[PDB]
Amino acid sequence: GPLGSDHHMEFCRVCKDGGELLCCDTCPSSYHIHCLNPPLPEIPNGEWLCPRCTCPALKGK
Ligand SMILES: [Zn+2]
Ligand SMILES: [Zn+2]
């Protein structure tokens, strides 16, 4: 809506696509299921933390 496109990144940091944006519940990692290192076969139905929150690193990437 007005003054509110979405939260975090309005597009994919990787592919620049802002459709099925898979963003971390914490970090502004608005990605996709194939716009990360570990590819997901489907979109997580709920809350999903970025592919960096899965480990104590990848934050300075
Ligand atoms: Zn993408
Ligand atoms: Zn995260």
Own/partner pairs, 53-59, CB within 8 angstroms, 24+ separation: 53/24, 53/26, 53/27, 59/27
Q: Which ligand is nearest to the CA of 36?
A: 1
CA distance 2 to 52: 31
Give distance in angstroms: CA of 17 to centre of ligand 2.
19
Which residue type sits at 17?
A: D
Please tell me the distance from the alpha carbon of residue 55 to that of residue 28, in angstroms, as a whole number: 16
Cα–ligand 2 centroid distance for 12 (angstroms): 15
* Phi/psi of residue 7, nearest 5 degrees: -105, 160
Residues 18, 44 contacting (CB under 8 angstroms):
no
**16 C-alpha vs ligand 1 centroid, how far in Å?**
6
Q: CB 51: neighbour CB atoms within 10 A?
A: 20
How many residues are recorded in the chain?
A: 61
Pick the CATH number of 1-61 from 3.30.40.10, 3.40.50.2300, 3.40.50.1100, 3.40.1590.10: 3.30.40.10
CB atoms < 10 A from the CB of 60, how many? 5
CA atoms within 13 A on the CB side of 30: 16
